Symmetry: D2
Subunit: 123 residues, 4 copies
């Protein structure tokens, strides 16, 4: 029953700031606590970000984006296993196993996340 979980960073774990002072992006401390609890329990935590794909481009993420992001995540005390970049950008993903951070936090608060059932058509 160990889950394989994928989290956005921006406007999810931290809040976007248009000043783009990335190392100082502000955490949602409730998200950090919840992810850390899941990490401690033995779930796999992957972070996946589109950051930089439009601003510096795919060839520059490694140099120009990753240092400040990784440092931010350390400063806010986030535990995670995997960090993946080059996420594509859509206005919406419609996905049977997707959840927004508000629902995630609500379920974690109630202790209901680990057994929460994903969508099925049930035709």
């Amino acid at each position: 029953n160990m889950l394989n979980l994928c989290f956005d960073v921006d406007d999810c774990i931290t809040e976007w700031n248009n000043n783009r002072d990335y190392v100082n992006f502000k955490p949602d401390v409730e998200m950090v606590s919840a992810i850390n609890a899941l990490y401690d329990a033995g779930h796999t935590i992957t972070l996946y970000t589109a950051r930089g794909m439009k601003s510096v481009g795919p060839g520059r993420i490694a140099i120009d984006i990753l240092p400040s992001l990784i440092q931010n995540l350390a400063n806010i005390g986030l535990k995670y296993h995997n960090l993946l970049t080059h996420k594509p950008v859509y206005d919406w993903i419609i996905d049977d196993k997707a959840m927004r951070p508000d629902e995630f936090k609500a379920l974690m608060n109630k202790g209901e996340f680990e057994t929460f059932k994903s969508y099925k058509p049930n035709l």
Copy 2:
């Protein structure tokens, strides 16, 4: 105001069947109608699937998976622009701009989808 949308195929547009007779996968006709309406209105429709990644493997999706999928989508009368494969598999994606098909259908039924706002931390 034109949206860039990404949809799962399995257990989203169609229902999974363990017999893996892919061409005969059953459509959620409400999903098909909703997607077609968005297509007709000018939104970009991308389908993104993990199908085959575990069963035939990434080198075989092009040969062994795509033909029956494309035929199924034609038989059900789905309109779409883009079809992408090799989707990674997670138990959950936690994403500020994600939605499950039930919420998608509910919003489309009400005429609220196009202006529905994505999640922000609002710290």
Copy 3:
């Protein structure tokens, strides 16, 4: 979970266009002409137990990445069957460069020359040897 592999099996990746077949600007893809020598050489390696992957950029500029699955793959796969090519894997969305400089790369002319002499399987890749 033991997978069977010939001892000294090679994992090989081949371009399709201007490699296995010749480009034609008419873009009648199903009728692209094969280099029969390439087809024979690849088939020989397939028969010996090597893994054959085909990797193509076809369509990336003409129809775009979202359309390759629908508009490019059928005629390509049919072409490869018609020319009698044996292979294991087919991958798309290859990036486009004027040159890849790579320690384990070879152009089709060298590939054919080595295969003619029976020297391909043991041919050594580049090392700096500084």
Copy 4:
């Protein structure tokens, strides 16, 4: 395509992709990545091409087997980038997660020895790629 025209400038900019390991630097099994030794002739050649206006992309498989794809960003990139800075390499793009094959057979591929040879002779920029010529 008249020489010196915009079209000519554009056509003469090449889009180049280089391996890092056993190409720009030499592999060492000790995996002390920051101290990997440069082929100074490769560094000079790439820097010359960078200065002349060509696009320089580096592409590496490093880490894919040792730490895995989820860890390359954290565990592999810092020491690689530092190495490339210490050796004085100029480049535009750095890409990871390269797949591994024993050989790529490709109409537009060249090994570092041929690359260096052509650069030494001033013949790289106009060197023609392979065509079947059936």
